[PDB]
Design a protein that fits this description.
Helix content is 31%, strand content 22%. The chain is an alpha/beta fold. The chain has one domain: Protein tyrosine phosphatase superfamily (Protein-Tyrosine Phosphatase, Chain A, Alpha-Beta Complex), CATH 3.90.190. A nine-stranded mixed sheet has the order 1-2-3-11-4-10-9-8-7, sandwiched between helices. A two-stranded antiparallel sheet has the order 5-6. Strand 2 and strand 3 form a beta hairpin. Helix 2 packs across helix 7 (263-280) and helix 5 runs parallel beside helix 7 (263-280). The longest helix has 18 residues, at 263-280. Bound molecules: magnesium ion. It is classed as hydrolase. The entry lists the keywords PTP1B, Phosphatase, Allostery, PTP, hydrolase. It forms a monomeric assembly.
């Protein structure tokens, strides 16, 4: 039982210690493509890079590089693409990746400005009548509708491949209330958001992998994928208490470095899974 695990760590105040064991135990694989000089301006942070073996490749000949990783959770039948918040010069690459990977949903866990600094380019349109065109990748993006709620916003976007004149509907799920510092006090609104993403079909295997990002694509983004996969495994397994958060987290870190950036995010991830378990053990 992980509810017990939680009390013992919390009573002992040993979150920082747990977190360090994860750090020391985590995989390290080469990131040679990310560190090429021609890609320096495609990385928002010098210390956050995709591993070569799991990086997403753009279907480009000049430069196929984008700071994005495929997380493949085989037992759960879930795949995610985790990426950084786009830079002013990588918005076209971002939407190219969504197109090429056949994704249905984009999950955004940050605000464009936090702590007085820009964390992400404004990569979607803010008004229906002012569409965006990405000339480098030949894509057009139109805002179709926007549903603003207290904790999150959902947008319907139309992505058009100008080369083929094909169009696809993309759902943008934007969690807007993650605090500038720390983690939410309660996981309730985070879990409600996660279940809205689930209910949309965006995580389902008929579609390409959902795209998840925050600023670096490892902290908040990691919390989202970890909670979703843990809750799914507790639905699937004969023994739900066989699901270990630390084991799942180390498996995901084989695919992208640094997932879960602070001991507070680790604690929050436990809280979200524990609370979410109450709903998937059957509270209709
Ligand atoms: Mg208007």
């Amino acid at each position: 039982e992980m509810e017990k695990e939680f009390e013992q760590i919390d009573k002992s105040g040993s979150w920082a210690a747990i977190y360090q064991d994860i750090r020391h135990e985590a995989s390290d694989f080469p990131c040679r493509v990310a560190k090429l000089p021609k890609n320096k301006n495609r990385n928002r942070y010098r210390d956050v890079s995709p591993f070569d073996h799991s990086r997403i490749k753009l279907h480009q000949e000049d430069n196929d590089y984008i700071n994005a990783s495929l997380i493949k959770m085989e037992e759960a039948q879930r795949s995610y693409i985790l990426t950084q918040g786009p830079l002013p010069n990588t918005c076209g690459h971002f939407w190219e990746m969504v197109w090429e990977q056949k994704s249905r949903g984009v999950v955004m866990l940050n605000r464009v400005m936090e702590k007085g600094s820009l964390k992400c380019a404004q990569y979607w349109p803010q008004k229906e009548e002012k569409e965006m065109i990405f000339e480098d990748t030949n894509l057009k993006l139109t805002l179709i509708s926007e549903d603003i709620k207290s904790y999150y916003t959902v947008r319907q976007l139309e992505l058009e491949n100008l080369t083929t004149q094909e169009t696809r509907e993309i759902l943008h799920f934007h969690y807007t209330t993650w605090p500038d510092f720390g983690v939410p006090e309660s996981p309730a609104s985070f879990l409600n958001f996660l279940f809205k993403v689930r209910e949309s079909g965006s995580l389902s295997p008929e579609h390409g992998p959902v795209v998840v990002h925050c600023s670096a694509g490892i902290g908040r983004s990691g919390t989202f994928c970890l909670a979703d996969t843990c809750l799914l495994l507790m639905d699937k397994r004969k023994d739900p208490s066989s699901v270990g958060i630390k084991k799942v987290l180390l498996e995901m870190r084989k695919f992208r470095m640094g997932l879960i950036q602070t001991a507070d995010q680790l604690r929050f991830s436990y809280l979200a899974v524990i609370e979410g378990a109450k709903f998937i053990m059957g509270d209709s």
